[PDB]
Amino acid sequence: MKVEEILEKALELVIPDEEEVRKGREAEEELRRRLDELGVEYVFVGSYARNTWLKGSLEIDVFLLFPEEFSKEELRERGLEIGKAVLDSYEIRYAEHPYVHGVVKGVEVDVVPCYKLKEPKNIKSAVDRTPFHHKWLEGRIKGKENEVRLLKGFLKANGIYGAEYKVRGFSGYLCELLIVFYGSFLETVKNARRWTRRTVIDVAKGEVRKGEEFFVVDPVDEKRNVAANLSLDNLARFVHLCREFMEAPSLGFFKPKHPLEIEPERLRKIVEERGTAVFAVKFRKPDIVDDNLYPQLERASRKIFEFLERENFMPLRSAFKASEEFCYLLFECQIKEISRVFRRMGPQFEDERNVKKFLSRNRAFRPFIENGRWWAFEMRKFTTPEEGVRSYASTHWHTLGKNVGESIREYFEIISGEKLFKEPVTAELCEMMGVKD
Amino acid sequence: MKVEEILEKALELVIPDEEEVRKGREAEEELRRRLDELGVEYVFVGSYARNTWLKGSLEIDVFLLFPEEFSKEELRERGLEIGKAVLDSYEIRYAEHPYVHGVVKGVEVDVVPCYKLKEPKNIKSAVDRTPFHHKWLEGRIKGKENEVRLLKGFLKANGIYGAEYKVRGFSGYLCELLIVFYGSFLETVKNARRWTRRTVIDVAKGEVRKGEEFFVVDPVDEKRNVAANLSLDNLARFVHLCREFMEAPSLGFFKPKHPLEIEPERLRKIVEERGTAVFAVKFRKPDIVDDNLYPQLERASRKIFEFLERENFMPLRSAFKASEEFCYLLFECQIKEISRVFRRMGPQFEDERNVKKFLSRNRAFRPFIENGRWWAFEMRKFTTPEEGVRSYASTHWHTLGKNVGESIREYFEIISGEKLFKEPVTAELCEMMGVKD
Ligand SMILES: O=c1ccn([C@@H]2O[C@H](COP(=O)(O)OP(=O)(O)OP(=O)(O)O)[C@@H](O)[C@H]2O)c(=O)[nH]1
Ligand SMILES: O=c1ccn([C@@H]2O[C@H](COP(=O)(O)OP(=O)(O)OP(=O)(O)O)[C@@H](O)[C@H]2O)c(=O)[nH]1
Ligand SMILES: O=c1ccn([C@@H]2O[C@H](COP(=O)(O)OP(=O)(O)OP(=O)(O)O)[C@@H](O)[C@H]2O)c(=O)[nH]1
Ligand SMILES: O=c1ccn([C@@H]2O[C@H](COP(=O)(O)OP(=O)(O)OP(=O)(O)O)[C@@H](O)[C@H]2O)c(=O)[nH]1
Ligand SMILES: [Mn+2]
Ligand SMILES: [Mn+2]
Ligand SMILES: [Mn+2]
Ligand SMILES: [Mn+2]
Ligand SMILES: [Mn+2]
Ligand SMILES: [Mn+2]
Ligand SMILES: [Mn+2]
Ligand SMILES: [Mn+2]
Ligand SMILES: [Mn+2]
Ligand SMILES: [Mn+2]
Ligand code: NA
Ligand code: NA
């Protein structure tokens, strides 16, 4: 319905509602009140400050600004003190150096202590450059706030907003840098059609060039890749969505797909048509934060995938899910049953001592020579992919992530069939198998 | 029972019997009679001449010796004429240049025409060096005739005597050169324990050295490998048999193993225990000689093996058999059934034009991105190895050898199970699966 009219309608799905904007301003004024009474110098940074936050993601970022001559724990101990006095409730979170996360009048706030540096040139981590992030964007982004919200809404409706590990998508700072570089949502989307996995966007030089990896150069620190947490596959999904949108634009690109919600009977039918083995490893969810859990689920699922490939079960795809109580690692394989017998490699015929050792073992069938080398028929200890994973998980839990592995050691189950379709995984199965509406 | 006493007992299994020696001498005298009346110059060569032929392999080789100045077809036309006058019956065989094979008083004779060269130095093929083979061996092998017969009997009882393609073993000329080089059967067997696939035996230089392939240098022609038709796997089998014999010598090494002769019920049991797919391609045997047929059966069986590997049926081993009326190509696979669905590779995400073409095809399930590249779920046209070979044999017969392929084009069958155990292939199946006594 013409690109320009679709973008006007999308603004209603992307701009926060009335009670959100008011809820936020009440919390900000109260927060100013408490900090001012303590005599601390501070600055509100982030998407709240710059009026670029997406509908439904209200969150207030504050940095406490201190004299340049204070030690490492003079900023840690003192900075925390103020953060605990100013919030209704709090939690010691850990991004790189510890900060405070809490609530003020029912609104999430982060309080981060750092130096008051005149000019940046002083490297440490991402914490100490964040004030300079705000300083660089403030007033380069003025007038373009809705362009930022269009880009964030687009990305969110398609599951790729956020740099946290559950997502591996686009951060808020990244969205704002893109809008500054290209000028608008529409120009971002038109130009991203030509991005590659080697594209380097150098915001401070107004330059695009080729490199070894996808790299967005932080204008505050030339060694920092702002797109570091963006996965290759999510970059690919975004380039394809940009091409599709420009080919046939729709308001539907700004709305989240309502899920498949299939009945166990239709899934049973689909699994019968495909002729595959479909199963899950179930275990208790360890008590750790998402940014620690999700890298472990990814690793555990890859190590089991690699086992299935090496054992000739021909895995197609894998997925994983965490609920409140349990985690699930999901697999589909092309092979449901393999023969008991397999071929084990022995030595070359010339090597007399090692040939004697190879032929000494008792076996049911006779070894043989093929292309100058000895081989023997031997028996597998499992013949289905479910039996294989039971064995792998019981013995090699120590490679499946520190905490995920320790949980599997205590308890796991392999589930298939009518039992599997009753766990909260039908949505992940459907996506993994490419099931249509 | 002591190596030396075993070798004395083996001489009875290796030396021709009474009526064989007499049957041969009658045919030789008659043959001399007929050639002498024609005024042709000739010489008896080969294992008959030198009294080195194994029990049960009586055959007389004659070469007709002609003046040096006769053209290529002056030796072909004239040489044939004499060969047809001298034999009771005949056949035009083809080794390299045509010769005559027939019978005299119930004994096989070959008559080959070639030049009467003073000194060898005149290269053409293996035909024109054969008189010089005899000349070089005559009287180097005197006194060692039973040593040669021990070596041939050893090799025969173990299925590796003969350079013809059905066997790919040791020729008679090769056995005689080995006995000259090492001095005896026992010294041959002790030294062959250390042969490798790089061993070069240079009989004329009294030297063993290393090369690129196993090579026995003809003392008449330094460019000719006398062991050219010996397979790598039969060289390996011979080195291992030599090691075993010296470790625990037995008369049993000179006797042929009496076969397994299993009942269909025991084979059914074994196939059930292994859990594999076992099947054969059956077709009519083309009307051609063995040295043409066996290379074609080997090729056809390899091309089908390579198909099964490429289609993920995990073939273990293959074999082949020709009876009087039919041929059989035999296979055992680890996978009895594979899923209908498989993963087809598409283009990298960057390549917009080729991505559009890939996503245009109608399919039952949705394509997906993985590690920067597009993939699609598609459906196989067969799910068992038997169904796969039916398809391969029907469409790609043109790669299965000229004559074997043309027969399969006219008629073939895939046979498994209780039907398979009733064809004359149980012995080849047992060997292929390493079945024990
Ligand atoms: O791990 C890190 C490191 C550094 N920072 C830095 O802290 C600042 C605030 O981090 P946010 O991710 O909250 O940025 P935001 O407010 O712009 O976006 P949304 O909440 O709307 O998603 C950003 O400017 C970033 O540079 C992180 O956010 N996370
Ligand atoms: O490339 C490979 C990898 C692994 N393997 C075999 O599979 C097993 C598991 O290999 P994994 O890599 O899945 O588990 P792990 O890290 O716990 O390995 P280990 O420390 O226990 O060795 C190993 O014990 C190895 O022998 C291979 O044979 N080849
Ligand atoms: O293809 C060829 C080429 C050449 N020759 C040459 O012709 C001669 C006779 O060929 P034979 O193989 O009949 O030799 P043989 O008589 O020594 O052994 P057996 O029959 O007892 O097995 C051999 O000396 C060889 O060099 C072939 O036999 N075949
Ligand atoms: O390495 C290979 C070989 C073969 N193939 C595929 O399998 C088929 C049969 O490959 P074959 O090599 O078994 O038969 P052929 O000689 O008759 O091959 P064509 O002349 O018909 O091509 C071919 O059509 C080829 O596409 C591969 O995909 N990869
Ligand atoms: Mn924020
Ligand atoms: Mn924040
Ligand atoms: Mn927070
Ligand atoms: Mn930075
Ligand atoms: Mn392990
Ligand atoms: Mn002969
Ligand atoms: Mn002959
Ligand atoms: Mn003959
Ligand atoms: Mn020669
Ligand atoms: Mn073909
Ligand atoms: Na195990
Ligand atoms: Na076909």
Swiss-Prot record, chains A, B:
UniProt: ATP binding residues: 47, 50, 133, 152, 161
UniProt keyword Transferase, yes or no: yes
One Pfam match: NTP_transf_2
Cofactor(s) named in the record: Mg(2+)
Alphabetic keyword roster: ATP-binding, Magnesium, Metal-binding, Nucleotide-binding, Nucleotidyltransferase, RNA repair, RNA-binding, Transferase, tRNA processing
One of the GO biological process terms: tRNA surveillance
InterPro entries: CAA_C (IPR048833), CCA-adding_arc (IPR008229), CCA_tRNA_nucleotrans_2 (IPR042090), NT_2-5OAS_ClassI-CCAase (IPR006116), NT_sf (IPR043519), NuclTrfase_I-like_C (IPR011068), Polymerase_NTP_transf_dom (IPR002934), tRNA_NucTransf2 (IPR015329)
Top EC class, one word: transferase
Residues where Mg(2+) binds: 59, 61, 110
Mutagenesis / variant outcome for changing residue 50 to A: High decrease in both AMP and CMP incorporation
Catalytic activity: a tRNA precursor + 2 CTP + ATP = a tRNA with a 3' CCA end + 3 diphosphate; a tRNA with a 3' CCA end + 2 CTP + ATP = a tRNA with a 3' CCACCA end + 3 diphosphate
Recorded coiled-coil stretches: none
Residues annotated as binding CTP: 47, 50, 133, 152, 161
TM region positions: none
E.C. number: 2.7.7.72
GO MF, any single term: ATP binding
Quaternary structure annotation from Swiss-Prot or TrEMBL: Homodimer.
More details: A single active site specifically recognizes both ATP and CTP and is responsible for their addition. In contrast to the eubacterial homologs, the specificity of the nucleotide-binding pocket is determined by both the enzyme and the tRNA.
Entry similarity comment: Belongs to the tRNA nucleotidyltransferase/poly(A) polymerase family. Archaeal CCA-adding enzyme subfamily.
Task of the protein: Catalyzes the addition and repair of the essential 3'-terminal CCA sequence in tRNAs without using a nucleic acid template. Adds these three nucleotides in the order of C, C, and A to the tRNA nucleotide-73, using CTP and ATP as substrates and producing inorganic pyrophosphate. tRNA 3'-terminal CCA addition is required both for tRNA processing and repair. Also involved in tRNA surveillance by mediating tandem CCA addition to generate a CCACCA at the 3' terminus of unstable tRNAs. While stable tRNAs receive only 3'-terminal CCA, unstable tRNAs are marked with CCACCA and rapidly degraded.
HAMAP family with a match to the protein in the record: CCA_arch
Name the UniProt record assigns to this protein: CCA-adding enzyme
Gene designation per UniProt: cca
